[PDB]
Design a protein around this ligand. Structure first.
Ligand SMILES: Cc1cc2nc3c(=O)[nH]c(=O)nc-3n(C[C@H](O)[C@H](O)[C@H](O)COP(=O)(O)OP(=O)(O)OC[C@H]3O[C@@H](n4cnc5c(N)ncnc54)[C@H](O)[C@@H]3O)c2cc1C
Ligand SMILES: Cc1cc2nc3c(=O)[nH]c(=O)nc-3n(C[C@H](O)[C@H](O)[C@H](O)COP(=O)(O)OP(=O)(O)OC[C@H]3O[C@@H](n4cnc5c(N)ncnc54)[C@H](O)[C@@H]3O)c2cc1C
Ligand code: NA
Ligand code: NA
Lengths: 243, 243
């Protein structure tokens, strides 16, 4: 009878199995777990913490796998690679057979079924991975009554990760809806245009007087601005959570 | 006997006296206090909160005046204007004679002389204003033995706000030192080059084993990266503060 895959105090090494190109700046990285029957086992709303040595110093970043909670023997990371981003460049230089050091689960989010009537999720870019993990857990549980509205914001149409997956979840589940926003939309776009606005949020989420938890993840200036909008709209800090 | 200039619970109106261009995207704005013998009255480490109405909705942002604590009958804000920055745009469209609504003081900082042996400050852009307010207070206190090391990072040489004032402080006070960092340095530059690195911080601040507080203010991606460095170098969360 085996240990859980991750330990919250001690880093373990996990080997890169394979990688593939998603778009110009994004790749999918598949790592082996230590046993074919292991699963990652992240609690809802929690993440992996990864460490690497770069120029003789250790660097640390959080990641949320996009493989579903129940996938056996491996986990998948979708990683956007930044021009001067130390860890995404480190991971994008690993070859099959190389290792990544990982501990967890980490994170202060504390999920209980039906903890709120409504979740408003705001995601930019790879901010979708923590949202996808929470949403999946909610919609696949048939006792959950939580309504989920996602505002998913990117620059260009080709930046919209997991569009097919999200579109399928929304077709299949009454309680999950997605609103897409693009700084540079194509002609005939039916979604949001520009940055996420206070109007877009007021139109799509229940107001402060309802039982709502708003969750955000994206680049730090997007998180900063969402918090400004939630202040504008009258939500209190107890009603939101930034990953 | 007059009331304090700011009230922490209620906004009051303060008139724009005049404005001046500092560089291509930065202006200095001078606001009248209600009586010529008033001072703005912000305790060390605290800020004012400004509100405005943009497209029917209230927005709110913090600012720290750059006028010294004892200036009578006005306060000065140096403000960088961003292309899609709602508040900085609002403020840059005010004419002399228009009002700005302000409340205060706001913030957690609680000055005690010699609360730490060393302060490491990291500022980017207008993140210098809260740092300047704290450093001015420390260096003018005879009892203070706190060593202050400031890393001040900007993109171009013309973006280094308050250089004259910072350098005069460093020459007068041996406990105050500044290291300037530029992404785009001029020919002959002897300061830091690029983004602020873990090594720049290690070379200028005392190690985690020391009695140190690190204070950061800057654009949100700079603050997120600085926190990455402080984790790399072994500082714990109780040893740092983001304004
Ligand atoms: C819960 C959670 C889950 C996440 N899940 C994923 C995921 O599944 N997939 C994914 O790709 N990401 C995910 N992220 C993001 C991840 O943690 C990292 O932030 C991301 O991988 C980029 O890290 P980096 O080291 O490559 O670049 P960063 O260090 O974050 O650099 C990014 C950019 O910032 C600027 N920059 C770099 N250094 C500095 C500096 N010294 N000063 C100022 N600016 C600087 C540069 O322009 C650089 O290109 C998640 C985050 C959280 C919180
Ligand atoms: C203690 C403290 C003191 C400060 N003192 C000063 C000071 O003296 N002077 C000063 O100038 N500033 C100061 N600041 C910062 C100030 O509070 C504001 O952050 C700043 O004025 C910019 O606000 P803004 O509304 O103009 O732009 P922001 O709303 O912050 O927009 C800035 C940029 O972010 C991007 N952006 C805008 N909206 C969104 C969105 N919806 N999603 C994603 N990205 C978006 C755009 O590129 C925009 O140009 C201080 C901050 C603190 C915490
Ligand atoms: Na950003
Ligand atoms: Na930024």
């Amino acid at each position: 009878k085996r240990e859980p895959a991750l330990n919250p105090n001690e880093y373990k090494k996990f080997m890169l199995r394979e990688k593939q190109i998603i778009n110009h700046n994004t790749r999918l990285f598949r790592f082996n777990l230590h046993h074919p029957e292991d699963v990652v086992g992240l609690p809802i709303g929690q993440h992996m913490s990864v460490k690497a040595t770069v120029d003789g110093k250790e660097i640390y970043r959080p990641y949320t796998p996009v493989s579903s909670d129940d996938e056996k023997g491996y986990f998948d990371l979708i990683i956007k690679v930044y021009e001067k981003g130390q860890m995404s460049q480190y991971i994008d230089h690993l070859n099959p057979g190389d290792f990544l050091q990982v501990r967890g689960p980490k994170g202060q989010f504390d999920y209980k079924p039906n903890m709120v009537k409504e979740m408003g999720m705001i995601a930019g870019g790879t901010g979708i991975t923590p949202m996808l993990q929470v949403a999946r857990a909610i919609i696949k549980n048939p006792k959950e009554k939580t309504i989920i509205n996602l505002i998913f914001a990117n620059v260009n149409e080709d930046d919209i990760l997991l569009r097919t997956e999200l579109d399928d979840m929304a077709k299949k589940y009454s309680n999950f809806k997605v609103y897409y926003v693009l700084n540079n939309p194509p002609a005939g776009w039916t979604g949001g245009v520009g940055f996420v606005s206070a109007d877009m949020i007021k139109q799509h989420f229940s107001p402060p007087s309802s039982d709502i938890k708003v969750m955000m993840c994206g680049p730090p200036m997007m998180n900063k601005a969402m918090q400004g909008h939630l202040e504008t709209l009258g939500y209190t800090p107890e009603q939101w959570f930034i990953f």
